Amino acid sequence: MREIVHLQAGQCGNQIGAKFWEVISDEHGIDPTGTYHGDSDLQLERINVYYNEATGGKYVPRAVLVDLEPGTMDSVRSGPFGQIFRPDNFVFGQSGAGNNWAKGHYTEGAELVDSVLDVVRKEAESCDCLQGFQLTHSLGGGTGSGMGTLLISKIREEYPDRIMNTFSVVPSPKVSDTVVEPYNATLSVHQLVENTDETYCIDNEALYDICFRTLKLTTPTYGDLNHLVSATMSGVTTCLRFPGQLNADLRKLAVNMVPFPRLHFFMPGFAPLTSRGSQQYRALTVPELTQQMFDAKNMMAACDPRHGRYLTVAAVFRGRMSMKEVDEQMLNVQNKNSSYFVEWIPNNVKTAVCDIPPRGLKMSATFIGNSTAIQELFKRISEQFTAMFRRKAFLHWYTGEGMDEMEFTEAESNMNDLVSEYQQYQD
Amino acid sequence: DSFRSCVGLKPTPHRKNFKKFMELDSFGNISNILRYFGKLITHKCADVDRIFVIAFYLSDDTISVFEPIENNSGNAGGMFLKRSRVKKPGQEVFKSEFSEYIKAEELYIGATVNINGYLFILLNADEYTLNYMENNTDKFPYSNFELAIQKLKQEKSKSREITQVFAAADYNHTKVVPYNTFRDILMSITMGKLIDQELI
Amino acid sequence: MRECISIHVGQAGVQIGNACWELYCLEHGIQPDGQMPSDKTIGGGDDSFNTFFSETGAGKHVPRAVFVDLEPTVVDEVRTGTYRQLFHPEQLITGKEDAANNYARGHYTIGKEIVDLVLDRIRKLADLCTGLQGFLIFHSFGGGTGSGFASLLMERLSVDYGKKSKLEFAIYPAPQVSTAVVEPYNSILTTHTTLEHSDCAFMVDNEAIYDICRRNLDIERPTYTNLNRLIGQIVSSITASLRFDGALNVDLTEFQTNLVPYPRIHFPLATYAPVISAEKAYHEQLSVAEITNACFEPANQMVKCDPRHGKYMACCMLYRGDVVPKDVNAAIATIKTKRTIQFVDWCPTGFKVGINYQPPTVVPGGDLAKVQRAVCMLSNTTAIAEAWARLDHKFDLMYAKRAFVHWYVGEGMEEGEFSEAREDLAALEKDYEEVGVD
Amino acid sequence: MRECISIHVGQAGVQIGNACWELYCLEHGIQPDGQMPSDKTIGGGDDSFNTFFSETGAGKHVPRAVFVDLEPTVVDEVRTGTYRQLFHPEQLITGKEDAANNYARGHYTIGKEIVDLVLDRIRKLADLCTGLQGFLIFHSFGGGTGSGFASLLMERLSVDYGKKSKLEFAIYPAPQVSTAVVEPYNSILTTHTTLEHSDCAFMVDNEAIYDICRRNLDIERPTYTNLNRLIGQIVSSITASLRFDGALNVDLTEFQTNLVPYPRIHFPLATYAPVISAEKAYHEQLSVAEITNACFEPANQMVKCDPRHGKYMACCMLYRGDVVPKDVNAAIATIKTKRTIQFVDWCPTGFKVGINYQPPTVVPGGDLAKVQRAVCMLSNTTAIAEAWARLDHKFDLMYAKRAFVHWYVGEGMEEGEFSEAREDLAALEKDYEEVGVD
Amino acid sequence: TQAMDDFDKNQFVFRHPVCRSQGLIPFYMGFIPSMQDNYALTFGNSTRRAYQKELDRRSHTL
Ligand SMILES: Nc1nc2c(ncn2[C@@H]2O[C@H](COP(=O)(O)OP(=O)(O)OP(=O)(O)O)[C@@H](O)[C@H]2O)c(=O)[nH]1
Ligand SMILES: Nc1nc2c(ncn2[C@@H]2O[C@H](COP(=O)(O)OP(=O)(O)OP(=O)(O)O)[C@@H](O)[C@H]2O)c(=O)[nH]1
Ligand SMILES: Nc1nc2c(ncn2[C@@H]2O[C@H](COP(=O)(O)OP(=O)(O)OP(=O)(O)O)[C@@H](O)[C@H]2O)c(=O)[nH]1
């Protein structure tokens, strides 16, 4: 059968997977001890897609945690669901990264890539046939980018017939904390475009705004932000685990989603985000679902596609809907703004309906988009790189690590080619 | 060590506390290992001649069992256990919790015990341990003679019954009495509830 | 794992170390004897102390610091104090003769037969350690024994061990107060030797520390106990990342990589915002916004520099206590919208944030506030050049009339080394303006 | 079974003697009278003492040793001491006249009429013994009486009984301290006579014993009470393998077979690592790693030899106490990976390990520390020839002018016996250099 | 607080009613009595052997 094995990379992913996994266990109803409480046959039917089973009815997750800093996973292991995570797959190193890309890409990786590859192939032989792999990490994360770029490269020749799902969060455009941050991203994206097949793009500023917009709770926890993104990533996974007529394979999706090979960057989308009184002040209807679904305020990924246009759009609906309301809404949205699409492709929408709602709400949906709104993103990272490569600030470290300015030249040059490509296909 | 691996992802080397080893340590001429003396129990007794030198190491709880060789017999023995901290004879084999080991709350005078197999019987001791017994009665309320005074002062009806029978044993009012009668004449008045320890 | 070794050289740098460990033993509940209560936290030396103390199977916390001195009086006096039983005896490295404020006397005459001894100490500390990220060197530029003694030992620990961090902390000489006029002599001697091996040199000045005391702490008459406690709080804040955790955790490797722009210059400036009195903290309130403004108020810095006379390169705020990402990120965003704070155009971002949930505790018999949200502000700016600019014109006048050189040529030097340091300083100043010029 | 006899030659070797059983009776808990309390360990003499004492049906522990002496004073005062009732009266073999520091006076004049008497003891103790693994010879090279008398008895015990081990222990001459200038005369006399018969000769020097006292034991002014207790522990450690057991037990036979590479040279070096004061051990920790570095620390050895000036053939560590092979085998693996340690390339392995569960104990009114993990370091290295190299140039000059020969040739010697020794010694260095050549 | 107590400490009082076991640590300098005259015990014990007898015979210690 067709299964998935998860990769948890970077110290951001360290919060991601834990929050990502606990929702699934709560979604499937497994207790913190690991002994499932069988209530829904279908969730018992479609748990083999992600979890393997151990003796005593304890579903072992098929995920791998990787890091270098022991303290982060000690909190994770001492978390409510660390017991559901294996001492086996806890692989790490005896080094501090310094939040350095080069160290994690050439120095520290060398003695750890062997161990992690030996690990993953063990669970790879444990399962039958994978759709592919998904990775939780950050493009701007010192360990996540350093580990990820090495690993995805190695996995490419290992299994060139699978799905290289990449889930990476973009740093805040205004503010990056890390000052070598534009270097690390530019380094990573050079290899990422070569190796990946899909990329989710996530930003915290919109998440901060969404807190102000619909959450309305002033001071939230970063974990609740992970709850949001875990909800987004779970929705696309609900397709595979659930029956009901929607085609679930990401390849069923990606071929409809990817017109040309170098298009990997895609944006999430989610359904009702509800506030203080709106829970009892909402008429939960597919129209208002569709209304709130297509809101630039409901947008959370990078920035407003109002600056650009739409190439490919795909929304997955979860709950008890019918073929007609989705049909007429797609007609409704088509007529409302016809010119805002690209004349290259008409009828560029892909719809899938999941009849199995989440536990807590009935009407729900997820959206994945590929618009002409990423220009500002890599255009933004262009200016800092040019200004900071102008006078080679903060460079004695990486040269000490063994790297040279030349590798920077093609990394930006490749990005410059993407600037033209994203520009040329639309403008 | 099974629980050391049951600590976190990284191991840790637990050990024994030096504290308890410090005070409880045979230092200088002062010794700490108690030595009791008893017999074996079987269907029939053959070599109960060997008075077993059970050596509970107060610092390690490691009862060594030693044997004094008897004239012209088939004993040819001595040490039976190499100062090994021994498992409780009340445990399982599939184990799920911290299993227990023989503490110091059972080696009362005239005891019945088992060291993992053969049932062994205690009869007497040495003075030095009993001197230690009488010092700290916190873990040894049996050594508390005043406690035994309460159990036997409970019975008041046997007063004359006491007076005549232990008068009956005496015939010349010599103001002594042998132990053998004295221990026997007490076992009845307690109806076989007295333990040898308080009688000593 | 996560540990380091603290070094305190100079009898002025020893009383500061004692207070830090007296402060350090507080948050861990260390009794002066060396053991915890009946509570079970002892082991093979593995708990919150493992990064700081060595409470091994013997049960006694052994501080992982070495106290080195050349005059027996004060080091004996602390050996007669209250926590002396905690201290490892010959880690309190004493000396029978002083350097007489002479750099070279503390570098050549006596250091040769003392360095080998402390070399044995560090290696038998090195072997027992596991990760040993770096070292915590407490000293002083104008050290009667601090200056010269530290110089050679920092050289030797550099040549054998050039793969790990070395953290430097010295009281900066008072720009207008000079307890000795030879203080410039050894101070520039320290700088020119330390430029090519030191990793991170952090400075501090007492006058503005005094100025803080009677401004907001309202201390017209301070004592070193106040000074030592407050600086001891400073290192406690920066080391809290090792002891506790937070939303994100940072390490000295990040501080090195992200603070220093280019080689040579590695001299940032620390600052702690919630320096207020208890009664002031009593009927007033603390939040991120005002402490963010206060930490960037120029009079709250302990170095006599006007940030408007220079330009900012790097910054680091270490928020310790109950804070949320929301207010902080918006607050610093407003700081970026500020026009007065003139960062260099080279860095769009120059700040490093450290979030720790644990609130800083008070000390018995203390004088600080009751802080729930704290922050230590480490920053580097071009507004520091006037310091050495002050130093050089002080030096050139005295060097031209070569005062008290008979003391130095008397016991075995020449003018060449004193010559070299000047253009080295001239190199430093020109680099400061060259990077200062955009 | 397992037993040996001990011989203490010379009034130098006597105070080290009684210190042994003063130690020995302790861990056995023996009362000075000669009997236990009402408890039972007595019998046909078969328990822990059977290897050391002879506690027969009389119930008195009779030590298996002989005290031979030539001056009544010291041997009578111990015969009036505390344990004199324990000691057999006539095994305190006394004498009425001295050898006057002369080897041959004790070797010819008086030894003949005394060796027969001690031999009567020797055979009579031999008959009662059953296993009788070997002998314990406490003597001294610079023996005023130890020199001559030990040699003749060694010669006689060698010829009749050459099928068993003989363990020799003599204080090695001080490299620079000379209590008598006639010591070089009899010292080389002892060496050349002993090379062709002695099984294992073990030396030590008091100056380094003195040096340890004020380094870590904190003894600035010791006495033999401390000195004898230190070395008394040394023989206790090596004999613990016979007394108790452990993970594995080793015997003197293995010591002979595995330590000495080739005939002639049978002169290894002993060392004890956890030599430390009580408070140091109190607030510090002992583990295999640091004691393993300390035991190979060059200043830990009691012989004035630098290991970097020579090369190692054999080593022996005797872990007395609580140890496990894991950290042991790992630590010793790290030791062999070290580059400064220079073993000879012929032996990939040159170490012998002894594991004993029993922790070493303290003596009441003592000086040692409370030790759980201990180790004795019996090792042999080529760096010992310097001492004989020191002795020969000392000896050749004084022989070139023939000092005090009229004392020796006066009472019945000539030069040929002296003459044979110098080339036998010259053979020793040339043998040492040939074995120093690969 | 303390300085104001001085008012009550002096004013109406001024007016009148019109009336270790374990010694110390080694390499300690500074001469306490005795020491080097007695010897043969470790610096820790030498301090604490003294500590008990420094209260006995060299009692001129207060
Ligand atoms: N887990 C976690 N990560 C965060 C949080 N806030 C921001 N991040 C960022 O997520 C990024 C990715 O984490 P990692 O790839 O594991 O980081 P790293 O490789 O260890 O090195 P750094 O990026 O310097 O932390 C980090 O760089 C952080 O800056 C948070 O609240 N939790
Ligand atoms: N770090 C520190 N410095 C102090 C303290 N008190 C005074 N100072 C100043 O710091 C300088 C220390 O340098 P030195 O006086 O040479 O110290 P030293 O080299 O150890 O030798 P001494 O001169 O004997 O003290 C002094 O000149 C004082 O002006 C203090 O408590 N801590
Ligand atoms: N073994 C031992 N040697 C000691 C002691 N005290 C001093 N020494 C040294 O050991 C040597 C003793 O040797 P000798 O003097 O020849 O002893 P002896 O042959 O038994 O007879 P005497 O000369 O009377 O002592 C001296 O040179 C001292 O340096 C001690 O207690 N034991």
Q: Count CB neighbours of C88 within 10 A.
A: 20
Q: Which two tokens stand for residue D157?
A: 């015990």
Instruction: Determine the Cα–Cα distance for residues D185 and D420; give it in Å rounded to an integer.
Output: 13
**Those residues with Cβ within 8 angstroms of residue C75's Cβ, 6 or more apart along the chain or in another chain:** C11, C14, C67, C69, C92, C94
- The dihedral region occupied by A337, where left means phi > 0, alpha psi between -120 and 50, and beta the remainder, is beta
Instruction: Find the distance separating the first CA and the last CA of chain A, reported in whole Å.
Output: 44
Place of tokens 């393993």: D292
Instruction: Find the distance separating the first CA and the last CA of chain C, reported in whole Å.
Output: 42
List, as one string, the DSSP characters of A124-171. Answer: HHHSSEEEEEEEEEETT-HHHHHHHHHHHHHHHHH-TTSEEEEEEEPP
Going along C126-244, which residue ranges are E strands? 134-140, 165-171, 200-204
The CB of D253 under 6 Å from ligand 3? The reply is: no
Q: Which two tokens stand for residue B161?
A: 């019954």
In terms of C-beta distances under 8 Å and separation of at least 24 residues, what long-range contacts does B60-65 make, across chains too? B60/B85, B61/B85, B61/B101, B61/B102, B61/B103, B61/B104, B62/B86, B63/B102, B63/B115, B64/B33, B65/B115, B65/B120
Kindly report the backbone phi and psi dihedral angles of residue C319, in degrees, each rounded to the nearest multiple of 5, phi listed first: -80, 110
Which resolution, in Å, applies to this structure? Answer: 6.5
Instruction: Find the distance separating the first CA and the last CA of chain B, reported in whole Å.
Output: 43
**Those residues with Cβ within 8 angstroms of residue D82's Cβ, 6 or more apart along the chain or in another chain:** D32
CA-based angle D174:D175:D176, to the nearest 5? 95
Question: What residues are paired with C168 via a beta bridge?
Answer: C137, C201
List, as one string, the DSSP characters of E11-23. Answer: HHHHT-S---TT-
The ligand 1 site (C-beta within 6 Å) comprises: A 10-12, 14-15, 97, 99, 137-138, 140-144, 177-178, 222; C 247-248
Q: Count CB neighbours of B195 within 10 A.
A: 14
Q: Are strands B64-66 and B112-114 parallel, antiparallel or unpaired?
A: unpaired
Say which amino acid occupies C8.
H
Instruction: Determine the Cα–Cα distance for residues C258 and C353; give it in Å rounded to an integer.
Output: 11
The CB of D15 under 6 Å from ligand 3? The reply is: yes
Spatial strand order in the sheet of D134-140: D92-93, D65-68, D4-9, D134-140, D165-171, D200-204
Going along E1-62, which residue ranges are E strands? none
Instruction: Find the distance separating the first CA and the last CA of chain D, reported in whole Å.
Output: 43
Say which amino acid occupies B38.
G
Kindly report the backbone phi and psi dihedral angles of residue A323, in degrees, each rounded to the nearest multiple of 5, phi listed first: -65, -20
**Those residues with Cβ within 8 angstroms of residue D385's Cβ, 6 or more apart along the chain or in another chain:** D310, D428, D429, D432, D433, D436
CB D3 within 8 A of CB D130: yes
> Which residues of D participate in catalysis according to the annotation?
254
Q: Which two tokens stand for residue C349?
A: 């971002």
- Kindly state the helix (H) or strand (E) to which residue D406 belongs, with its residue range: helix D405-408
Q: Which ligand sits closest to the CA of D98?
A: 3
Instruction: Determine the Cα–Cα distance for residues C367 and C353; give it in Å rounded to an integer.
Output: 27
Q: How was this structure determined?
A: cryo-EM
DSSP H stretches of helix in B136-177: 145-153, 159-169
Instruction: Determine the Cα–Cα distance for residues C321 and D240; give it in Å rounded to an integer.
Output: 58
Question: What residues are paired with D9 via a beta bridge?
Answer: D68
Question: What is the best residue among C14, C171, C181, C206 to mutate for testing ligand 2's pocket, by most ligand atoms within 8 Å of CB?
Answer: C171
CB A352 within 8 A of CB A239: yes
Instruction: Determine the Cα–Cα distance for residues D161 and C388; give it in Å rounded to an integer.
Output: 86
Instruction: Determine the Cα–Cα distance for residues C257 and A98; give it in Å rounded to an integer.
Output: 7
> CA dist C216 to C213, C224, C274, D112, Å?
6, 17, 10, 97
- Which among A306, A217, A4 has a CA at the least distance from the CA of A131? A4
Chains with 3+ CB–CB pairs under 8 A to E are C, D
Half-sphere exposure of C396 (CA within 13 A, CB side): 10
Instruction: Determine the Cα–Cα distance for residues C159 and E19; give it in Å rounded to an integer.
Output: 77
Angle between helices A286-293 and A323-336 (to 10 degrees): 40
Instruction: Determine the Cα–Cα distance for residues D235 and B193; give it in Å rounded to an integer.
Output: 55
Place of tokens 């060392």: D271
Q: Which two tokens stand for residue C278?
A: 């208890």
Question: What residues are paired with C8 via a beta bridge?
Answer: C67, C138
Instruction: Determine the Cα–Cα distance for residues D252 and D134; give it in Å rounded to an integer.
Output: 8
Instruction: Determine the Cα–Cα distance for residues A398 and A54; give it in Å rounded to an integer.
Output: 45
Say which amino acid occupies D281.
A
Q: Which two tokens stand for residue B6?
A: 């049951």
From ligand 1's centre to the CA of A137, what distance in Å? 9
DSSP H stretches of helix in D106-175: 111-128, 146-160
Instruction: Determine the Cα–Cα distance for residues A366 and A350; give it in Å rounded to an integer.
Output: 12
Instruction: Determine the Cα–Cα distance for residues D306 and E44; give it in Å rounded to an integer.
Output: 31
If you count them, how many residues does chain E have? 62
CB D199 within 8 A of CB D118: no
Instruction: Provide, as residue numbers in chain E, all residues whose Cβ is less than 8 Å from the Cβ of C72.
Output: 29
DSSP H stretches of helix in C129-172: 146-160
From ligand 1's centre to the CA of A181, what distance in Å? 11
**Those residues with Cβ within 8 angstroms of residue C283's Cβ, 6 or more apart along the chain or in another chain:** none
**Those residues with Cβ within 8 angstroms of residue A264's Cβ, 6 or more apart along the chain or in another chain:** A166, A192, A193, A196, A197, A198, A199, A258
Say which amino acid occupies A421.
E
Instruction: Determine the Cα–Cα distance for residues C217 and C280; give it in Å rounded to an integer.
Output: 9
Instruction: Determine the Cα–Cα distance for residues D92 and D117; give it in Å rounded to an integer.
Output: 11
Q: Give the gap in angstroms from C-alpha C128 to the nearest C-alpha of chain A.
A: 16
Cα dihedral across residues B5, B7, B10, B11: positive or negative: negative
Instruction: Determine the Cα–Cα distance for residues D384 and D393; give it in Å rounded to an integer.
Output: 15
Angle between helices D12-27 and D224-243 (to 10 degrees): 50
CA dihedral B124, B126, B131, B133 (to 10 degrees): -40
Instruction: Determine the Cα–Cα distance for residues D292 and D302; give it in Å rounded to an integer.
Output: 17
Instruction: Provide, as residue numbers in chain A, all residues whose Cβ is less than 8 Å from the Cβ of B10.
Output: 70
> CA dist C254 to A178, C165, C167, D398, Å?
10, 11, 13, 71
- Which among D369, C33, C80 has a CA at the least distance from the CA of E28? C80
Q: Count CB neighbours of B115 within 10 A.
A: 18
Q: Count CB neighbours of E55 within 10 A.
A: 10
Q: Which two tokens stand for residue B160?
A: 């004359």
Chain A CB within 8 Å of residue B8 CB: yes
Q: Which ligand sits closest to the CA of C185?
A: 2
Going along A339-398, which residue ranges are E strands? 349-354, 364-371
Instruction: Determine the Cα–Cα distance for residues D172 and D208; give it in Å rounded to an integer.
Output: 11
Chain B CB within 8 Å of residue D372 CB: yes
The secondary structure of residue A276, as a DSSP letter, is T
Place of tokens 């109806």: B191
Q: Which two tokens stand for residue A269?
A: 């989308």
Ligand 1 atom at minimum distance from A69 CA? 20
- Which among C186, C193, C96 has a CA at the least distance from the CA of C152? C193
Spatial strand order in the sheet of A90-91: A90-91, A63-66, A2-8, A129-138, A163-169, A198-202, A265-270, A364-371, A310-318, A349-354
Instruction: Determine the Cα–Cα distance for residues D68 and D157; give it in Å rounded to an integer.
Output: 15
Place of tokens 């995570």: A85
